[PDB]
Amino acid sequence: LVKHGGDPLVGDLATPVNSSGIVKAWINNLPAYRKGMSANARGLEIGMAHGYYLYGPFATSGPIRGTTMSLVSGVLSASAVVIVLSVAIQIYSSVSSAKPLPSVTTADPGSDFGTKEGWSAVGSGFLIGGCGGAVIAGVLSYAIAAF
């Protein structure tokens, strides 16, 4: 593992952190980058992952924590955050022209981010995923608590 510069004139050093095999494997197979996904699918996976993650800080840390209502807070909060991100994707895509450029970590990023079509697809995914994520995490929190 050594630092080397692919196309040395570009400001991008291959390092064990950006160009390693284990890393390239993970990054290039995350749903942003993973080959052969419909943009909608990319978004649905990114969404589900984030909604599900987002449930936790809100349910755990927020103002009505401990109470039963905390689970509902968690879900609605995470879903609100996802709706705000959904807005962000729509407005971003509306005004975005830029395409993801090939990098050290990801030689073939793809077009799903980089076309207005792609971002709309991803956003529809992201919304359904995120709010689903958040609901699933609340459902599981209630489930495990009961069990």
């Binding site: 705000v84 807005v87 407005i91 509306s94 005004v95």
Partner: peptide
């Protein structure tokens, strides 16, 4: 209409601020 505060405030601050920020975003990015 004792509750009109609990409706008007989130509407204006969150929904209106959101919509305003979205619109200003479109406005300065188009």
């Amino acid at each position: 209409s004792d509750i009109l505060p609990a409706i008007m405030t989130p509407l204006v601050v969150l929904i209106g601020g959101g919509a305003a920020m979205t619109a200003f975003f479109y406005y300065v990015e188009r």
